[PDB]
Each structure stands twice: as C-alpha cells, then as structure tokens.
Amino acid sequence: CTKIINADSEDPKYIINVKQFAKFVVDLSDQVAPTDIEEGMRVGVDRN
Amino acid sequence: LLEHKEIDGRLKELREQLKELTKQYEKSENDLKALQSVGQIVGEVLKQLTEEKFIVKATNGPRYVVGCRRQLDKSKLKPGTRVALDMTTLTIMRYLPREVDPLVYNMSHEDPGNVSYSEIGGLSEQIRELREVIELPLTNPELFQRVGIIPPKGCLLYGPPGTGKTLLARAVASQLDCNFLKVVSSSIVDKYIGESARLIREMFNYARDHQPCIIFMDEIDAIGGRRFSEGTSADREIQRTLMELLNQMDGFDTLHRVKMIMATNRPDTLDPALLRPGRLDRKIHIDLPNEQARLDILKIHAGPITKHGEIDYEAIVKLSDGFNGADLRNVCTEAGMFAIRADHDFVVQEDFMKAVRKVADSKK
Amino acid sequence: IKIMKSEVLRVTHELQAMKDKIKENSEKIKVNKTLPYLVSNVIELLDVGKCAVIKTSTRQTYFLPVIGLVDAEKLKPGDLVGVNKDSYLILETLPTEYDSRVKAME
Amino acid sequence: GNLLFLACYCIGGMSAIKPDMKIKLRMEGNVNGHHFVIDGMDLEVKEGGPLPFAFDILTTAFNRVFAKYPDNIQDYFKQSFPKGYSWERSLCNARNDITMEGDTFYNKVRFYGTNFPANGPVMQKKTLKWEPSTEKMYVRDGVLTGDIEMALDFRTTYKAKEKGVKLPGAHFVDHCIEILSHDKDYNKVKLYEHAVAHS
Amino acid sequence: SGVDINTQQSFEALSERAVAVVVDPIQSVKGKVVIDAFRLINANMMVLGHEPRQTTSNLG
Numbered sequence A: 001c002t003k004i005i006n007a008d009s010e011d012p013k014y015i016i017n018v019k020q021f022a023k024f025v026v027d028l029s030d031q032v033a034p035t036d037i038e039e040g041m042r043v044g045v046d047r048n
Numbered sequence B: 001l002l003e004h005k006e007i008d009g010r011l012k013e014l015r016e017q018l019k020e021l022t023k024q025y026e027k028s029e030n031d032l033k034a035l036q037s038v039g040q041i042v043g044e045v046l047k048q049l050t051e052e053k054f055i056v057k058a059t060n061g062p063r064y065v066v067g068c069r070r071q072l073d074k075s076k077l078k079p080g081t082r083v084a085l086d087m088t089t090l091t092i093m094r095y096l097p098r099e100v101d102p103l104v105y106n107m108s109h110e111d112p113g114n115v116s117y118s119e120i121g122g123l124s125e126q127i128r129e130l131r132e133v134i135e136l137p138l139t140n141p142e143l144f145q146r147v148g149i150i151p152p153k154g155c156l157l158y159g160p161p162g163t164g165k166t167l168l169a170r171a172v173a174s175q176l177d178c179n180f181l182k183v184v185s186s187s188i189v190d191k192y193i194g195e196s197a198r199l200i201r202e203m204f205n206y207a208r209d210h211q212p213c214i215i216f217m218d219e220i221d222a223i224g225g226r227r228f229s230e231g232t233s234a235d236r237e238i239q240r241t242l243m244e245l246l247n248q249m250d251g252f253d254t255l256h257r258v259k260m261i262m263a264t265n266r267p268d269t270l271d272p273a274l275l276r277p278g279r280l281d282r283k284i285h286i287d288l289p290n291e292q293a294r295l296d297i298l299k300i301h302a303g304p305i306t307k308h309g310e311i312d313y314e315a316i317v318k319l320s321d322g323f324n325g326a327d328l329r330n331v332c333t334e335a336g337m338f339a340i341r342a343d344h345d346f347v348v349q350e351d352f353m354k355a356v357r358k359v360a361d362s363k364k
Numbered sequence C: 001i002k003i004m005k006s007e008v009l010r011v012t013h014e015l016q017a018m019k020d021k022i023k024e025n026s027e028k029i030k031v032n033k034t035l036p037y038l039v040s041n042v043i044e045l046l047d048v049g050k051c052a053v054i055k056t057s058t059r060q061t062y063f064l065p066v067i068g069l070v071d072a073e074k075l076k077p078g079d080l081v082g083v084n085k086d087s088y089l090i091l092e093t094l095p096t097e098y099d100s101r102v103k104a105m106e
Numbered sequence D: 001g002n003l004l005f006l007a008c009y010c011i012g013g014m015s016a017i018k019p020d021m022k023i024k025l026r027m028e029g030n031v032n033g034h035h036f037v038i039d040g041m042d043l044e045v046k047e048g049g050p051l052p053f054a055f056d057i058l059t060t061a062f063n064r065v066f067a068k069y070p071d072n073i074q075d076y077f078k079q080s081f082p083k084g085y086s087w088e089r090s091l092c093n094a095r096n097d098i099t100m101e102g103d104t105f106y107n108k109v110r111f112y113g114t115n116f117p118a119n120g121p122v123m124q125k126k127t128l129k130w131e132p133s134t135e136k137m138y139v140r141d142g143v144l145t146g147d148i149e150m151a152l153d154f155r156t157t158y159k160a161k162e163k164g165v166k167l168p169g170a171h172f173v174d175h176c177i178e179i180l181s182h183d184k185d186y187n188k189v190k191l192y193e194h195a196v197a198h199s
Numbered sequence E: 001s002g003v004d005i006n007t008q009q010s011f012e013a014l015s016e017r018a019v020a021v022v023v024d025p026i027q028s029v030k031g032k033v034v035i036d037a038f039r040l041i042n043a044n045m046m047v048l049g050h051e052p053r054q055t056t057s058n059l060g
C-alpha cells in the first residue's frame, strides 16, 4: 500500500502497487478500519 | 404595471439566474460522451501490406495485421506513423503525430517571452543580416527562386559570453512567433552511448514535423569541436554526435522550412565540415558592444527603471569600457537594490555611478 | 403579462424536469465512475477539442479521444492519474508520486 | 569521467486474472456480546467461537430458498424471483441484505439483539427442539406480515423487490425447523429448513 | 461462472425450466455463431451418482 491520499473518512482510497502487476487506486473492505491500514504495509486484496 | 413591476418579480431569475443550471446541463452533456468512449491502443504502422491490410505494431506489445477505417487518409499512413487502434476490433482508427521525446518536449515548451527587437541594443547590421538569412526564406521564397538561390539553411552567431546571442535568438523567435527549440549543446551529451545522437535525431525530426521551427543550438562548441583520432571514448562519442548533427543538417534528406541558429564563444574550434557552407552559410560576429552600441544598450535597458531628474549614458559608457550587455543590465539591477539601502522610491545619478563601479569591481 | 406568465410557467416546468434529469445523469456517472481506478502516467496531450495519450501501469500505451471526467489544462505530461479499468478514460487526477531523489531527501 | 557505458535489459513478466467471484453466504450478528459471523445447508461459524448463547436463538434467520406452497396458495416467495424477497425478522431483530463487497456476492443475514436476560434460557445453551410452528401470513399495510408463535412472538415482514406481485391471502404455513447435525462446540452444524404452506 | 451459476439458481427458483443462454459477441465472426444454453445440475442429483439428465435419443 502507498500514499493514503489524506482520507479523513471521506477519501479512504489508497493507491496500491500489486508487485510486478499494475497499481490501482482502491478503497477498503468493511472488515478493516483505516487505523489498521497505513503506507507501506503488505495488504491482501480481492481481484476485481 | 400591475404584475409587471420589473418582470413579474420572478422571470428576472427564472430566466437566467436559475438557468445557470443549464450550463451544468452542458457540463454533464460532455460527460455522457465522455463515458461512451472506450479509449484505444496506440501503435506504429510498420508496413502497407496491401491497400487495406496494414502491418501495425502496438507499443510494448504484439504486432498485428489490421485494416483501416472506411474513411481515412491511407496516403498519410506511412510506415512509422503513430496510430490508434480500436481495442476490440483492432482497426486503424486515426493517425497520430510522431511521439516526441520528453527532453525534446521540455526544450520545446519554454516560452520566448515575446521579447521585442527594441530590446537588443546596438546590433543593427548584424540583426539585419540575421533577420535576412533566417526570416526572409520564411516570407518570400519566390524572391529567392526568381533570383535562383536556395534559401539558407542556417548561420552561426559567434561572440564572447554576455553578448546577447541567446536573447537575440529569443527575440527572433518572438518576432516570428513560430516553434522555437532553445537547445544548449552541453545538455545533450550523455554517458549512455547512443543517446546523444538519438536526441539530435529526435530534435531534427521534431523540427521537420513542426515546420516552421527554429533550432537554436547554444554553445555548439561543446559538440562540433573538430574531429581527431586521439581515441578517448568521450571525444569519440562527441564526434559521433557531431556527424549525426551534420547528417541531420545537410544530409541525404534535404531540409525544407527549418533554419538553425548556433551560438558559441569559441568559433575557432568548430569542425571544418560543420563550418563548411550548405550547413552554416553565414558566420555572424556578434562582437563586444562598441561605444555607440554600449550607450544603446544602456538606453534600451534603462526603460523599466524610473529616472529622477538626470541620467546620462555617456559617463557610464566611459566608465564601463569592456562591458558586454548583461553586465550593463546588472548595473541597473543592484542600482534598484542600492535604492533600498537608503530607502528611496527612485534612482539617482550617484546611485547609477556607484552601481557601475561595483559592477566593474566585481568584473575584475 | 398573460403570455409572459405562460412563458414563466413553461420555463419553470422545464427546469423541474431538468432537475431530475441532472439527478439521473449524476446517478449514472457514479454508476460508471465507481472506485477502483487504475494508475497511469499521462504521456502527453494532442489536438484534434483535445485528446490524450497515457501509459498505464500495465505497461500499455493508450490513446483517449476524450480526456475522461476531469479538467484538461494542467494535465502535465507525467501527471499520474486514475483512469477507469475497462473503458480507459481519466476518471480522476491524483497527486504526483515522487521524483526519486527528491524523496531520498526528506 | 570517460565512462560511456552501455545498458542491458531484464524484463519482468506480469499478468493476473480475476477468477469467478465466489458467493459467500455469510451471516453476521452482535445479538448479545459477540460479533459472530457464520458461513453456509451446512453451517460453520467463521468468527465468534463457541457461542456464549445457544444456537437456536439465531437458527431462525437462515433468498435462493423458499417454502413449498400448493397450487391453491399464491407463492409470493416464488414469484418474487428472480430478484428475491427481503424480510425483517423480529425476535432481537434480523434483516437480510444483498451487497457487492469485494469480489464476493454477500448474502448477509445480519443479526442484532438486545435485552439479554442475565439467566435467560437462550444463553445456558439448553435446548430440546423447535416444535412445528404455524405462521399466519396476512397483509397489514401493503406488507406481507407473518405472525408466528415461537415454541421450543415473530412478526416477519416480507417485501419483494418486484413491487408488483399480488399479495396472497391470509394463510397458515407450517414451519418445522430443527438443528439436524452439529457438534458440542457448535462449529460444524447442519440445519433443516423444511416448511410447507397450509390453507 | 460462479456468479453466473448464482443468478441462474435465482432464475430457476422462479421456474424449474429456465435457460441461461450466453453469447460470445466477439467470437461470433461472420459464419459461426458462438452461443450456448445451460440450465444447471442439482447438487443432490450429482452427489447421489445419478446422471443429470435421462437420455432417450441421439438428439442430445
């Protein structure tokens, strides 16, 4: 995961680099709070 | 006027004020089309297999044979022409102008700043010669052809630093208001072996694509510094770049509507092949300003500054021998700075006198 | 007055309809501008009233006859953007990543 | 200084594929104290290990399935398809939601409760069975309310997404729901949802 | 797909006979048309070992 894009509970999207694959700006799943997500941690994400 | 006070008390806003929303109607309008477009591959046409089948290579991807759209200029589908491809049916959608190097783009989009021919100072004969040799082919080629001469390819502008070659070329571009390629030679030499000549090729290909363009290659002594066989790798790569420039300049592919300006401080080290005509037909000695040229420089650069009472160019000219252009402008600059030492809102003769004194001292 | 009041009623009804038309447009624009945009470096902007060419992070160059759903003036050739993952138009602009060594110094 | 070095090139192959997104039929709840979530008709509690309460308190909240109706009785459950029916269940309240979160078709049966007695029969995990219960289904205010007595009040409300299906007359459908197979820890459960309509 | 099977289960709940034809629109180049129609197999039918569909002719 990369820059938080300054969410403040209204822009929770982050751009994430999936390895040698592309990078996408995405949002969170309901099961994770933003406090658990921060720049530079490995995150498991869905595929579509 | 019973219910016709101004207009029913409602239509004044019901007609236009709320009708501002219709402008947003226009806004979302673009959006609808902005959502029915699907985007397109970009590739380069490799070959014309037949009147319909085009061998086209997508960038960083596979290559295909693809047909073109029903209405298109197949004559302009030359090999190497960057094109777009429908992502689904994979057909030639529309041609694109040749991809430009980011370096060439950056060198191509610096604003000349509309500097006027008034703002040069004492270059009348040389500025007239340069105006001739560059601009006249861009005005009346019929004049030259009835005379019978081929319009000049370009010219060299040699002189000591600070003599205004960069500003002179910038002014030429501003008067022309054409595509300007302000290029400094020292910025194109690279450790990557084949990249400098590639950059020169990209520069000249951009120039050919965007006629009328002006190629201003500053500090050309950093490229065309004579060819010799000592054999060190660096100067050898420099010779390779120089000969790439020579080909791009007076090579097999004849040049049309592209004129070049090359400024240097050491004209004597230029390569004889580059020095030869056909490439640099004119050598213009933009030399140190003379006394008349000096006073012209002061009077022209004296414009923006506000003068209180009396300011004489002649004394500054006598006290500033050996000055060349920018340094004279320096005299003005710190003068305004001098104006803040004693907190004025203007300038005085003593201000300018001590300013030119400090400039001369710094020049020592 | 009478014909002018009729014009007033006509214009207010067309506004009343166009409000919900705008609401529907916004609904469908959110329907298509969902969220999982794909990052891409805008290679440059060309003229046709402007078109773009970008380089997505799936190492693919991509020509756009219309530059998505953002403005079209700043759009630096290198401006990282979030472009839709299927129809490939610039749905949003996002702040630049870094310039390598400029990150090296804090 | 006179470096002038060449350059090699090492490509990195890159590719992936989104699979057939998998529907997870999961229910969530926080009825008394635990955010229990169960996947499922075999039942398996995902999180919220061995329940502080009995399973039965939540067994009644379990689309894609509907009771069997005769030809005389209009099958609002059936003709509400393909969209299905959304219900509000009052025990503690239960609602079924259909969401698109992530790459999983979420058929939530989100559970919620309150007013848990400190010695109520629902938390000591005692359980005999659920005797067959008859739900009287009738329309109150355009909503199909089913009144059922719990034997071991229920005020079910069923609304079809297709808000055009005619409402069946007040009938009495007999539900027989019992926990067929399970474990003592109640983590590997098999449920029974047999129910037939009766006029 | 899994979601396709899911929606088809939803449709079959409406009526046991219900088909889920799908069409490949870019593989349908002039000439051949790439299109098929599938219903389902009940899980209990398959796990019990019985074949999904009885056969009485060569048509199928």
Ligand SMILES: Nc1ncnc2c1ncn2[C@@H]1O[C@H](COP(=O)(O)OP(=O)(O)O)[C@@H](O)[C@H]1O
Pocket (backbone or CB within 6 Å): B119, B120, B121, B122, B123, B160, B161, B162, B163, B164, B165, B166, B167, B168, B263, B297, B324, B325, B326, B329
């Ligand atoms: N005719 C001129 N001759 C010399 N210098 C000038 C002239 N006109 C302006 N300048 C000064 O030269 C500065 C720009 O540098 P310049 O002298 O054009 O580059 P170069 O070193 O190529 O001659 C400007 O700030 C300006 O004050």
Ligand SMILES: [Zn+2]
Pocket (backbone or CB within 6 Å): E001, E004
């Ligand atoms: Zn499908």
